[PDB]
Write a protein that binds this ligand. Structure first.
Ligand SMILES: [Cl-]
Length: 210
């Protein structure tokens, strides 16, 4: 298809330059993230811990250093994206979706507990859904647990982690003076919002017990 570009953390001069490139490439340039976005450009050589970037990772977009815009504009060409792609999380996710593999939170369920202020609740719901996870409207417990109705696993869990098959998460906003006594009860973990965000930024289902 058509390319759809967006910038995260770009200066005004950078955003103009991105629009200039979209014209050269016959592409769209947006300011709000959408599932049609193909390319997220960052200002330097590092991922931004922003919603736009995180949505771009969960979508397996190209997350590219601003040098890509400079290079394309000097050549009037869509330069080869892999040579400008941010490594680690972005790249692993891009490859994951090219191979039509499960999204990061496939087989995972999330219940958003308590008050959210510094990780907006809307943001977390966006990210859950974008990563292929399921938002729960009632606190998870065994007598209502859908994972008994069909074998449910989390593809991105490490091989030998309980998170392969214990895939349900109570998420709380960290540092409310709350560390739990047990991080896991049955199939349900209690995890801070800061863990969830770290999983996204890394494209990993990071361990809670190990
Ligand atoms: Cl079964």
């Amino acid at each position: 298809g058509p390319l759809v570009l967006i910038g995260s953390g770009l200066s005004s001069e950078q955003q103009k330059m991105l629009s200039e490139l979209a014209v050269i490439l016959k592409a769209k340039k947006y300011t709000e993230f959408d599932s049609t976005v193909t390319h997220v450009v960052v200002p330097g050589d590092a991922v931004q811990s922003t919603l736009k970037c995180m949505l771009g990772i969960l979508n397996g977009c190209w997350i590219l250093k601003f040098e890509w815009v400079k290079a394309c504009l000097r050549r009037k060409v869509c330069e080869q994206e892999e040579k400008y792609e941010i490594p680690e999380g972005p790249r692993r996710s891009r490859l994951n979706r090219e191979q039509l593999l499960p999204k990061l939170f496939d087989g995972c369920y999330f219940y958003l507990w308590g008050t959210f202020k510094h990780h907006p609740k809307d943001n977390l719901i966006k990210l859950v859904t974008a990563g292929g996870g399921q938002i729960l409207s009632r606190k998870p417990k065994p007598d209502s647990d859908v994972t008994q109705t069909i074998n449910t696993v989390a593809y991105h869990a490490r091989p030998d982690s309980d998170q392969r098959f214990c895939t349900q998460y109570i998420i709380y906003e960290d540092l409310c003076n709350y560390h739990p006594e047990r991080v896991r009860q049955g199939k349900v973990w209690k995890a801070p919002s800061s863990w969830f965000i770290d999983c996204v930024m890394s494209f990993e289902l990071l361990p809670l017990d190990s």
